[PDB]
Amino acid sequence: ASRAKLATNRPFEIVAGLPASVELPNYNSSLTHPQSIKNSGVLYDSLVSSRRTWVQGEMFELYWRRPKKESPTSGTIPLIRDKMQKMCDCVMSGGPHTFKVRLFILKNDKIEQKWQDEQELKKKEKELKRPKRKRRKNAIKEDKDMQLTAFQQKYVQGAEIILEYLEFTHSRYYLPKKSVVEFLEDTDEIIISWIVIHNSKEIEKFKTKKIKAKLKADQKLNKEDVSFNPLFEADCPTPLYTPMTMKLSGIHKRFNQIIRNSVSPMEEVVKEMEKILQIGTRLSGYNLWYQLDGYDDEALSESLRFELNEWEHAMRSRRHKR
Amino acid sequence: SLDLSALANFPSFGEYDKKIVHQINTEINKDLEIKIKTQP
């Protein structure tokens, strides 16, 4: 935000701190002394920003962050480790960028209790009704790869999935329940799509206000003698919204069932999305001007250069901390 | 010498295309030395 306030009438606007315009840049018409992309680095800045944002953005709801340091808070690390189960390593693409992930399950205790009750019922039903062969080891391996081991047999449906970045293990995010999931059997690729609202906090707070108003009205009526959906409500503020889509690759057959079971009934979210699409304000698509004039944009160029220098200076320490 | 061939390429009161403007910028860029303060 503290970036230099661009001089009036520049042929670009500063979007996310960088020079961009809605229309495709016409350098040849607009620039007399264009600095090279090497000189500008705008492309570099954009790429670093993109990757970092993908590491830290709002795409998935955050749920756990490593606490910024005989404090017992150390003892909670193994507890948080055990509250999730450990699962195998998978690749993700974010726009032009790609990332890698290991998978972790969030232990739904109701599924554990119901599994114990189901085993009780099945046992009671059964009681009421009443060298070594390596090929068998290969069969067991394949069965455990496409059928389910005990932890997978309990967590088939309603299991909870946590995402973590293998290049940034500090943050954990929820897999979107309000998402469309397609499992490509031929390519082993999974595409996830969801709509995201930039002022969602505004909508949630107005939703809370409406809930309070309805509760007050019900209390007033009671003094004499609910699937509240903010997106349906006529007084909901305009969502600034974006539709998003992402592809996963590298997930194995057994995990697909867990994932496929985990997401919400499709028609309901489809109708919700259609409402969002009527009421939403779509994010406008714009084009970055990677080339800047060395004379009119000298301040902007140097500012970008300085910020890049600081970013790189910090980035070395990140691995030096490992 | 090659610029003279380039000069003959220049528009001659016809219907010529934008690509000339690239050469124009090439000549314009020659105006002064580039005061690039900090190397990228």
Task: Check CB contact of A39 with chain B, cutoff 8 Å.
Answer: yes
Q: Helical H runs in chain A?
A: 27-30, 37-40, 42-56, 76-83, 109-129, 134-146, 150-154, 200-224, 253-262, 266-279, 298-320
> How many contacts (CB atoms, under 8 Å) link A and B?
28
3 state SS of A217? helix
Distance CA A142, CA B36 (A): 62
Q: Could you tell me which chain B residue has the CA closest to the CA of A34?
A: B29
Cβ A94 vs Cβ A192: under 8 Å: no
Q: Could you tell me which chain A residue has the CA closest to the CA of B22?
A: A28
Cβ-nearest to B37 among A33, A38, A302: A302
Query: Of chain B residues 11-30, which have a CB less than 8 A from chain A?
Result: 18, 21-22, 25, 28-29
Say whether A28 and B36 touch across the interface (CB within 8 A). no
Task: Check CB contact of B40 with chain A, cutoff 8 Å.
Answer: yes
SS3 assignment for A9-34? CCCCEEECCEEEECCCCCHHHHCCCE
What radius of gyration, in Å, describes the C-alpha atoms of chain B?
14
Cβ A50 vs Cβ A44: under 8 Å: no
Instruction: Give the containing element (helix H, strand E) for A32.
Output: none
Q: Is A239 exposed, middle or buried (0-12, 13-18, 19+ CB in 10 A)?
A: buried
Give the DSSP letter of residue A291.
-
Q: How many residues does chain A have?
A: 322
Cβ-nearest to A39 among B28, B31, B36: B36
Beta-strand relationship, A61-65 and A168-174: antiparallel
Query: To probe the interface with B, which of A30, A292, A305 has the most B CB atoms within 10 Å?
Result: A305
Tell me how close the Cα of B11 comes to any Cα of chain A, in angstroms.
Answer: 17
Query: Of chain A residues 138-167, which have a CB less than 8 A from chain B?
Result: none
Say which amino acid occupies A71. S
CB proximity list for A263: less than 8 A, separation 6 or greater? A177, A179, A180, A181
Query: To probe the interface with A, which of B17, B18, B21, B25 has the most A CB atoms within 10 Å?
Result: B25
Cβ-nearest to A294 among B22, B36, B38: B36
Instruction: Give the containing element (helix H, strand E) for A97.
Output: strand A97-106
Task: Check CB contact of A307 with chain B, cutoff 8 Å.
Answer: no
Helices first, then strands: H and E counts in chain A: 11, 12
Resolution of this entry, Å? 4.4
Query: To probe the interface with B, which of A39, A42, A309 has the most B CB atoms within 10 Å?
Result: A39
- DSSP-assigned beta bridge partners for residue A252: none
